[PDB]
Amino acid sequence: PAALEALTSDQKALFKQQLELIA
Amino acid sequence: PAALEALTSDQKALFKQQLELIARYLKLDIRAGDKAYQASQESAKVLQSQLDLWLAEHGDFYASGIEPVFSP
Amino acid sequence: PAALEALTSDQKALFKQQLELIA
């Protein structure tokens, strides 16, 4: 689960960033 | 300007969608903040009514004249 | 496999959407 959580966290960063960047 | 506005609108759609789609993937929502805020409007209106009712039977000279000032 | 399938499904949705949205 940790690798998935990390990848989804990398995603979360990218995405949260886009949701503050595209935003 | 219209072509730019349209492209940026296509973008806006895509992006707003992603900001609701990637956001869906991330279980996120902006509207929730407003929902909580609306409940707070109700808190405000509720409390306000009571002041109105109070004042209507008392007057400002009374209201101000009854406040505590005692301090050891 | 189910978590991978779900993530790739979230992707599939996003992507199919883009393949109908970008499209």
Side-chain angles (χ1 to χ4, degrees):
Chain A
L4 179 78
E5 177 169 29
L7 187 155
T8 55
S9 183
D10 308 330
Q11 281 178 341
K12 277 158 181 186
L14 166 62
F15 297 161
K16 191 174 175 182
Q17 285 146 9
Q18 282 160 315
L19 282 40
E20 291 194 319
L21 193 184
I22 311 183
Chain B
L4 179 78
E5 177 169 29
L7 187 155
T8 55
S9 183
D10 308 330
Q11 281 178 341
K12 277 158 181 186
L14 166 62
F15 297 161
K16 191 174 175 182
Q17 285 146 9
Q18 282 160 314
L19 282 40
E20 291 194 319
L21 193 184
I22 311 183
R24 179 164 289 120
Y25 178 66
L26 299 192
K27 306 89 180 174
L28 307 177
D29 169 47
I30 62 193
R31 305 168 189 259
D34 300 345
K35 308 317 300 290
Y37 177 55
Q38 273 67 100
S40 317
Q41 275 71 89
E42 301 321 303
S43 312
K45 295 311 186 183
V46 163
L47 297 176
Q48 181 59 61
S49 66
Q50 306 302 289
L51 312 172
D52 317 329
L53 180 61
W54 186 12
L55 292 164
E57 294 272 337
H58 283 267
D60 298 325
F61 272 99
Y62 180 100
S64 55
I66 62 152
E67 304 194 34
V69 301
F70 179 83
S71 178
Chain C
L4 179 78
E5 177 169 29
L7 187 155
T8 55
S9 183
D10 308 330
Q11 281 178 341
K12 277 158 181 186
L14 166 62
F15 297 161
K16 191 174 175 182
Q17 285 146 9
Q18 282 160 314
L19 282 40
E20 291 194 319
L21 193 184
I22 311 183

